């Protein structure tokens, strides 16, 4: 029936997240729609001293972890409890790309 379901997917690298996007859009055109929302990029920042001892020129590392997030809440009533499964197993099983479903 109708359960206002929403799809959220998260990843650290921008190449699979866009590939997963395309597969899902391809596989959800019928079970209603599935247009994406691209969120602001959460970037984690850590600055560290490059030295373990504190000697010489004060030189710094600059790491970061960009996390990309997309959100298809377009299923909505257009997907039933089992219908969500159909596509979610027909989409590729990329090794790393967290996914959670909620009404």
């Amino acid at each position: 029936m109708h359960q206002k379901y929403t799809i959220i997917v998260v990843g650290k690298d921008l190449k699979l997240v866009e590939r997963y996007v395309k597969s899902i859009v391809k596989e959800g055109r019928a079970f209603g729609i599935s247009g994406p929302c691209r969120a602001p990029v959460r970037r984690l920042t850590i600055t560290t001293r490059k030295s373990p001892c504190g000697e010489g020129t004060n030189t710094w590392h600059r790491f970061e972890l960009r996390m990309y997030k997309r959100t298809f809440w377009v299923t909505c009533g257009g997907n039933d409890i089992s219908t969500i499964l159909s596509k979610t197993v027909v989409i590729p099983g990329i090794q790393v790309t967290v996914e959670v479903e909620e009404p």
Partner: protein, 61 residues
């Protein structure tokens, strides 16, 4: 600070360790100094550069 539920569950016993206090430490090398609590990490700065690439932190810009 119980970094994980595993590491605890709530004569000398009268005063073995009665001075309860935060004991936050690196979850790799166990040191109590220079511990990044930001983002719920709990990794020392030294014990960090090594494993950062595995975790996913990278150096650009």
């Amino acid at each position: 600070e119980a970094d994980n539920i595993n590491l605890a569950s709530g004569m000398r016993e009268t005063e073995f360790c009665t001075h309860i206090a935060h004991k936050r430490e690196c979850r790799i090398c166990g040191n109590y100094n220079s511990v990044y609590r930001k983002y719920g990490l709990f990794i020392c700065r030294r014990c960090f550069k090594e494993n950062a690439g595995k975790i996913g932190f990278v150096k650009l810009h």
